[PDB]
Amino acid sequence: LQIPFPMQMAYRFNGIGVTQNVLYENQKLIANQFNSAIGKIQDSLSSTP
């Protein structure tokens, strides 16, 4: 069943006890930390052996 990815992720905040409004009101912040953490994980393998 398809579901838009912000609305998917808000369910996953709601599954760790954080309410759903914490996602949307910080959505552009959360996307930026997400992209900057997957950008950081190439460099954690394209570096230290």
Binding site: P6, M7, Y11, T19, N21, Y24, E25, Q27, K28
Partner: protein
């Protein structure tokens, strides 16, 4: 608990795993802040059940 669906015209609240649509009242929603910061937000009435109990 649930999600805001639309059948095309009107808006409802269902539980997430089984389609039963309810009327969006103030006892199955909660408010948080103004309707400015949420990216993608629709304008639909949220029916207060107290207000048609004064009459």
């Amino acid at each position: 608990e649930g999600v805001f669906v639309s059948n095309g015209t009107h808006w409802f609240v269902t539980q997430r795993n089984f389609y039963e649509p309810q009327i969006i009242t103030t006892d199955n929603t909660f408010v948080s802040g103004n309707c400015d910061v949420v990216i993608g937000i629709v304008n639909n009435t949220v029916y207060d059940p107290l207000q048609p109990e004064l009459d």
